[model samples]
Target: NDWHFNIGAMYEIENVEGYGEDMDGLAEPSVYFNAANGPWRIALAYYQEGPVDYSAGKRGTWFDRPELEVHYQFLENDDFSFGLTGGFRNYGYHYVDEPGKDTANMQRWKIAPDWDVKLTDDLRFNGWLSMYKFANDLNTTGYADTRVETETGLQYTFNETVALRVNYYLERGFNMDDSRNNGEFSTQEIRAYLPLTLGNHSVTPYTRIGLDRWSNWDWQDDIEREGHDFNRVGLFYGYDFQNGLSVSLEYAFEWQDHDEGDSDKFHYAGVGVNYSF
Candidate 1:
């Protein structure tokens, strides 16, 4: 009972509020290990160096990654249960901001399935199903581009703070620049997390929305501006501490109206801290 450890760190600086040019800075480090009846858990992470400024070609770009995760637990009984998760990742890339010419190292793998029940105690549900992959030299042309993605999510709990979550996706792409030109790509998201208490203090408030599509197959309107459709909205506030520290702040307002209208609008903010032992 002595194998639990955790550490975390994060930093971010971004600009573009009123379009005063573009600037970005980011740093992240996290480490974890767990074991205590509920199966086991493992996490190792790193994300270093700049430019992850909410994407959309936020001027140049940069990425360096080392992330590995694990979870174990195969069965449980009460109503229904399941578990399995595996993850590994190695990624690095930089473009426009310089240093990117294909094959910048890439390896990723995942297998996941997890479910939870108790669907009648104020309504409760849980979900996870994932298959992700990348690694095949990753088709370099200045690095970065190896795809296989599928993710699913469902959540609903109307008590003890309020909760609602939804997610879905499909990302299959090999090659076809101009924001990806037909290969396969699809994305979506919905989020709502609400919790509030002020006796000892507790607050969890969140909102997120998203959409995406990309297609490019050598002209043909190049899938009409990367085969597009989109929307977004966000706001989050969180604080829970009692030795199991946690801190959060998020403000995200984004809008893009485009079948084609030269659309772009983004307002972003993120602050983080999490610790559990």
Candidate 2:
């Protein structure tokens, strides 16, 4: 097979309300390349988050180091695919000369399995499941972590140009620390999107909701601040230019409530551009 490459950039802004004067943003650029080699297809990607500080009116903008990932798809067909992936992440870190912060990072590997089934030409179901194991403990916490995550979705096309998609995601993690127990950290998310296409342009609306439990292994009666609920609703519009280029913009409203009954709300807007070859 031939090689494929794509480069993309996006900027996002989050404005917080109930949380008080909280604003954050990210401008990120990414590149991905892939090719099929005999029985396996390989892919590599690089991504970076650069930014302008909207909150606190701070000094110069700081850009984080680039992150990289590699994956192999060993088996593929119309209905399913299986793969392995490994990545190094800058989960969190302290800047040079920054005070009172310690470096934190993770090296992890995962086994990924995915499936797709076409119930009809217009209806389909797709899903992916990944399990991760950490090679080294976090520098700050000294705890190894293991995780399992999955995503499942179904889509229905209501014409040549209109479609609806519904999805659910789940993640659970275990930390090899003295204070943690099995299934102590878990999260679930549900989302829906409807896309209406007009030629090469599309307008889509979507909503996502999430539930998280950080200390679920404790007695069920005392899980106060360990739980969180999240919600987001957004609209996105995209247009494809004549030469394999595309642009999109989105705006969303979000809300989060802790098990302590405190709530925080925010608005987010993002714009993205991409070119593929």
Candidate 3:
């Protein structure tokens, strides 16, 4: 019999919005279980947010829902691996005061397939897509609400110590008629990062750049607002201990300049540490 458990905690501080100048702290803890060759595994995670003062004086603190997931790998080889994963979570508590009105409570079900491939020792690609469906939520238009998300990346490992990765991500939502319209929500994003590592002391440093654009559907009240993309720049440092432990710290700055003569900026920082045994 072979089994293992892994655990970790992470903390982050960020501005909750573009203007109000409000900041919140988030703490997340997680655990995972694995057995043998692991076509099977399970994970549990929780997060809490505090000192939330969205508009000064309306203060509150709450948990950001919890998740439990199980996954199975259908294929595993030297060049490729593919799997199926599913999970359940309480999404009702998500984005409580995110400057929006349509707040509904429900149990969320997520189903997905993920794959990774190594075309060569130096080139690699991976992708994952998921569908999130709610048990008891529907828009005012008698439509079952749902969200689709996808993430994919390609990497070139130039050498043993340096590598560059290009990423693409998408999140699309359906509220009413299947067509893109005022009730649909969507975003297309692109990001790139370069990681450089030093010798066995196991230190790595990375730099990141990203761009995101909101789709025209339910994007804005002004027509010219589509002129600009949200942009981000970040730096991170990571250290790995040979004894199944790792830690990382990161800082990110983001801004958007819209064609409608509107702009916003935000700052964020975080630390994460984990161990396995």
Candidate 4:
């Protein structure tokens, strides 16, 4: 049996077009716990985010997400492994300084199947597909009641100290009530990461590029009129003490470009600590 615990915090600054350029900061804190015994594993996690400048006159909502997951590895071998995971998550949002708005909550149930195939000693293919059913108190007129997301990736090791991973991601939404208003949109992206290890220290740099991004929803009009929709670049650094303790730092910048509107920029910085026994 093995046990793991993680605690993390992130700060984000976002400046979306038409949403002012004041650059307010959002703070996110999270806790995660996992236990694995043989082929069976269980985990629980909680995450909370809100404006850091709320008391200093920032207007935003506080969001909390909690999840519980169970995983079972059905097959395992030297060449490949397959697993199934089922999870439940709750999303709760409380608005600040909004008079007529009530707290919004959503519940999600998900089933995910994941697999890993070892092609050679230095190369591998991995992927996962997740199906989610969402129940929400808010109106779903232009949103999705269900979502399907998948990511397939290939990882190649150049040497003992360097590796590269490339992945394709797709997410689509479906509305059981109204097909036309089904959050009728699709998002596709290609992401790549290069990781380098030096003794107890590791560094990774990554990038994401939007491939085909479009939406028919009423809320996201900018995505429909696109030139280069999305791009993100990030770097991560980590250190392991070899005493069941590890620490990590990360920073990312994301931007969205629309043909007819001003571009949007977002910045993220985070730190985390983990311990395993």
Candidate 5:
């Protein structure tokens, strides 16, 4: 890890079709470094993330922050390498908050043991476990709430062109009750990706299925928005020109049974492209 591999910047754009964003623009510039000796791998990363946002806002309704991360490699082998990682982020919209535009100060600490190994010539498996702790709670007119949660996942690759990915995502409040955020979806989904080749061009088509729900105590429901049950699916296709450039497109649809609170189901679709160095 003596030399640094600074990957070129990538940008993403998406549309409003879902419950969250109508339109967004975002970019990520990343740097990576490793050591030549010893088990310690040191890396310092800075990101001014979130040109992309979720809201139907005025001018300042976006999440903007800079992040720093430290990663360590603890184990290594031909088929497996696992490590521990942690990072910190600071909020930057200090003067951007107003009537309906703002995101609370954010802080996060996380460490996950990640592994990817080849089980056979054409088979592979991977998984990760992650946890997060928030420093403070967000103050909102609807409710007071803090964030704390864990995520775990698994994936299987049958060949270079195909893979099956499955993940279970769950979130429940640690200190604040349903008042803060009972609207989060406790979801499980399975996704499939198939890559097709066309001369110097390659395309990948993918789809997803999941179950979702809202926050338990988010008491803002009327007789109109109440069923609170949901089913969702999305399809996307990616095309790579084999020249360090690519474009991907997607469409998503959802159905819901809302007993109360928030819009039950919505859809979003968009396309994004980027070039690499």
Candidate 6:
């Protein structure tokens, strides 16, 4: 058969701080199934995010986000490749106190064009820009109807054992109702990663530095609008069994400096497993 399939799952736990006395941590889990044949690929994924304790109590609604994506390669050559991806995702919020109440759901549709260019045998560039359109079910006021997410990066390979990558990331929101432009904001960051590969095992260390952030988003009022600086340091380890199975572990610590308030810090741990056939 010319078709191949892959399945993966990841779980993460993050320590939450300064949000409130009721919220102390977060739980996230995701699973994905992918299949590819020739230059066509399809993916289905489900992602969930919920507070470990909301209002000093556990919640029942853990599956909050779900997405489905498809990709097609339109151009491919020895040194370059291009593709388009489109997906739909849903975000839902459920009230633990009011189990009878209807869930507030938001729908999103996204389209992205991505490409990779091998500049040389030792260097490459890759990027993607994703545009999102949102449909709000609860409240449209003070919310963004459209947004763009960007990720562009360059990779340099010194040898089979070591590689370095520098990436730029941005997420900007626009087209908000005039009643409250709070959702209209922009944030950007620069990140670097170094990976050391040794046969079936690999290790990566990374850092992210915030460059600009401007927002009045009320959902998380602790985040300042202008002078917010964010940074992170993380490490990842992965091992492959050479039998289409792999596992990974990651840990990250992040901090933010605000222009008006006290700084905050948090940490997270993640584990992932994947199998391909």
Q: Which predicted model would earn the best lDDT?
A: 6
Clash tally, candidates in order: 8, 0, 0, 0, 20, 0
Q: Give the alpha carbon lDDT tens digit for every residue of 1-277 in model 3.
A: 4577677877877763533524443333343343333577788877655445545644343336577888899998879999998999864443444555445455678999999999888888988999987555444222235778987999899988888888787877664444423435456677677878785343343433435554343344643324455677888877778687888888877776665536777667788878777
Q: lDDT by residue for model 4 over 30-94, one digit each (tens)?
A: 88888888898888888887764545666476779999999999999869999999999888878
Q: Candidate 5, residues 1-277: lDDT per residue as tens digits?
A: 3443223333334333443433343333333332323555444444443334446543333444455566676777767778776766554443244576455665655555666666665555665555555454244322223333333445565655555555554444343454444333343444445555455544555555444434444344621222245555666666767765666666666665555435445555566565543
The residue pairs that clash in candidate 1, if any, are: 101-142, 102-142, 102-143, 181-215, 181-216, 182-215, 182-216, 219-222
Ordered from best to worst lDDT, the candidate numbers read 6, 4, 2, 3, 1, 5
Top of the candidates by TM-score: 6
What does the lDDT read for residue 256 in candidate 4?
Answer: 78
Off by more than 4 A, model 3: 16-37, 54-63, 92-104, 137-144, 176-183, 200-212, 215-228
Better of 3 and 6 by lDDT: 6
Model 2, residue 149: C-alpha shift (Å): 1.9
Residue 168 in candidate 5 has what lDDT?
53
Model 3 global lDDT (CA atoms, 0 to 1): 0.65
The 10-residue segment with the lowest total lDDT in model 5: 140-149
Displacement of the residue 271 alpha carbon in candidate 2, Å: 1.8
Which ranges in model 5 have alpha carbons more than 4 Å from their true place? Answer: 10-57, 92-104, 117-122, 140-156, 171-173, 176-185, 195-202, 216-257, 261-277
- Each candidate structure's TM-score, on Cα atoms with residue i matched to residue i, is 0.28, 0.76, 0.76, 0.87, 0.62, 0.89
lDDT of 6 by residue, 1-277 (tens): 3999999999998874766522566788999999999889999988887666656567444447888899999999869999999999888777555445656778889999999999999999999999998877625333578899998999999999999999999999876554434477888999899999999999999999899987766535654455688899999999999998999999999997877658878788999999999
lDDT of 1 by residue, 1-277 (tens): 3566555555544443443334443333334334344577677777655544555545344556787778887777666678888988777765563444633666777777777776665554666756666654444522224454554455566666555655554555554344533334455545555656554355555554555665453433454335555555656666667687777676665665555457766566667676777
lDDT of each: 0.57, 0.67, 0.65, 0.79, 0.49, 0.83
Ranked by lDDT, the better of candidates 1 and 6 is: 6
Q: Which ten residues in a row are the worst by lDDT in model 4?
A: 14-23
Question: Which has the higher lDDT value, candidate number 1 or candidate number 2?
Answer: 2
lDDT tens readout by residue for model 2, 1-277: 6566666777666666643423254445555555444555455555544333556554222334344556666666765556666555444333333455445454566677766777777888888888876654343333346788988899999998899999898888776664543344777888889999998999999998785545454433565427778888999999999688999999999887777656877778888888877
Model 3 clash pairs? none
